[PDB]
Amino acid sequence: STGSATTTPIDSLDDAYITPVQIGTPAQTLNLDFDTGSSDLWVFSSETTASEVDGQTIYTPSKSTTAKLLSGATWSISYGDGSSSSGDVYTDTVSVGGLTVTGQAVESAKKVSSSFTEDSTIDGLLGLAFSTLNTVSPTQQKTFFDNAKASLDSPVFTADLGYHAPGTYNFGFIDTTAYTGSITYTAVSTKQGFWEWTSTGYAVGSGTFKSTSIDGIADTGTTLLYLPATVVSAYWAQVSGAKSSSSVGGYVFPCSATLPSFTFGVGSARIVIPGDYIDFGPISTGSSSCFGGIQSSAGIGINIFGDVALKAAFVVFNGATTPTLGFASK
């Protein structure tokens, strides 16, 4: 089997991407944030504290003839940015782009933090990291990809995120029309439960390439590119007036600037992030100070190849017995 679904930016800045997901019988369609940096499929629901729901579409398991309470099971997750959610668990039928999993754990939110409530466009998350990170207790549950894997034509999914435009998540096949040149594959460590890999270096604008190993995660659920302070400083040093602002919480730059590109290495291959992808616009409405899309990972504890990086590539998440990651230009 295969599946194919379009993923759409939630706003003009590409702060996140939503993909429609069919849950239950009859189908209830929710728009979920596909997140290769976590491993829980959770949704706003009829159980979510009413004051914490503001415009989201909810899953109502009582209206699904295939929903079954997973007795005794609870979940609770906290993300790096301080957001969180928790609740109980149902199993139900979940389909993405024509690909159907029966008995998928659908984690129903009883509580969500303010940032989720304030995001009216995101109805939940669909995790695509390794199932070892799943938070369901006392019986850990598998991700949608893990459940689908054996049935897929090939045990893979691909992320093709757009810049200010829709893109595609595919399951079970590689669309050879969706990228240019060849796909370069690179090793993955699953030791932390992430799609963790080592970039071979970077360049800033038309500058020379610096060969240096950068361990990080391919994370569709994080907006920005978080890299070591040395790398980030080298980038922003090429933008007149750019500075790190503790009050804003990162690098900002004059909105009048033209940003240089940023290149990252995948083995001997190179992925170029155009300067425009690094512009996240005014810090507040009407400001002439703009927020940068490349930020320091110092104090995160891990480097994160978030949407800023991934949207510059066609990315293969290869879930073979020994997983690997593939990157192509597009």
From Swiss-Prot:
EC number: 3.4.23.22
Enzyme class: hydrolase
UniProt superkingdom: Eukaryota
UniProt keywords, alphabetically: Aspartyl protease, Disulfide bond, Hydrolase, Protease, Signal, Zymogen
A GO BP entry: proteolysis
Domain (Peptidase A1) ranges: 17-328
Cysteines engaged in disulfide bonds, as pairs: 255-290
Active site, UniProt feature: 35, 199
Catalytic activity: Hydrolysis of proteins with specificity similar to that of pepsin A, prefers hydrophobic residues at P1 and P1', but does not cleave 14-Ala-|-Leu-15 in the B chain of insulin or Z-Glu-Tyr. Clots milk
GO MF term list: aspartic-type endopeptidase activity
Similarity comment text for this entry: Belongs to the peptidase A1 family.
Name the UniProt record assigns to this protein: Endothiapepsin
Organism: Cryphonectria parasitica (Chestnut blight fungus)
Lineage: Eukaryota, Fungi, Dikarya, Ascomycota, Pezizomycotina
